[PDB]
Amino acid sequence: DTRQHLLDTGYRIMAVKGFSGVGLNEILQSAGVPKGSFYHYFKSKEQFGQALLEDYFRVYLADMDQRFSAPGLNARERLMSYWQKWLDNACPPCDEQRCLVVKLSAEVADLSESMRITLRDGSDGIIERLVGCLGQGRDDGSLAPCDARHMASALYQLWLGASLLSKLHRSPGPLETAMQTTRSLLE
């Protein structure tokens, strides 16, 4: 229970203030968990950060596997519903930036090397499924030919950038632009 309570409280804090500007002290009084009880689950603030990331990429990559493997859907449909998921998981007007590549990639220089290695890996793992799914649509005729490596990265950048700007402006506008653009570049 309390391990997970710390992890969920780690995420909510992480979504608003990042990881490196946040004392363990802050995490602790936000979780309402005592210090002693923290060191029973995690060796460190740094290791608690790894756990959070690790946990974050697993849930995220698994959802992407489920979706990009959904029977009865072509590669266009599988891919589109992932972008829709992004557009619908975002709340422009909430303080929480739930997309950590966006949150943490902006703060990467003040992170440890281990955290940076995990963040690039998680991030490479998203692009890679995007490439897979693009390549798969060329096989079932669902998507017009393209350089799939190039397209995947182009699309991911576009959406990261819209996440970033959506949060600045507390507005849905930039994610709508990302979607509209994604429809044009595809089909």
Looking at residue 109, the DSSP 8-state letter turns out to be: G
Q: Cβ(25)–Cβ(93) under 8 Å?
A: no
Stretch that binds a copy of itself, among 31-39, 46-54, 58-66, 117-125 (CB under 8 A): 117-125
Stretch that binds a copy of itself, among 1-9, 52-60, 84-92, 107-115 (CB under 8 A): 107-115
**DSSP-assigned letters across all residues of 4-16:** HHHHHHHHHHHHH
Q: What sign has the CA pseudo-torsion 160, 164, 170, 174?
A: negative
Minimum CB distance to a copy of itself, residue 36 (Å) = 27
* Residues 21-40 as x/- pattern, contact with a copy of itself by CB under 8 A: x-------------------
Stretch that binds a copy of itself, among 41-49, 55-63, 66-74, 159-167 (CB under 8 A): 159-167
Two tokens, residue 150? 């190039």
Q: Cβ(134)–Cβ(146) under 8 Å?
A: yes
Which position among 28, 61, 87, 165 is part of the footprint of a copy of itself (CB under 8 A)? 165
Residues 151 and 36: their CA atoms lie apart, in Å, by: 49
Q: Cβ(45)–Cβ(110) under 8 Å?
A: no
What residues make contact with a copy of itself under the rule CB under 8 A? 15-18, 20-21, 95-97, 101-103, 105-110, 116, 119-120, 123, 150, 153-154, 156-162, 164-165, 167-169, 173-174, 177-178, 180-181
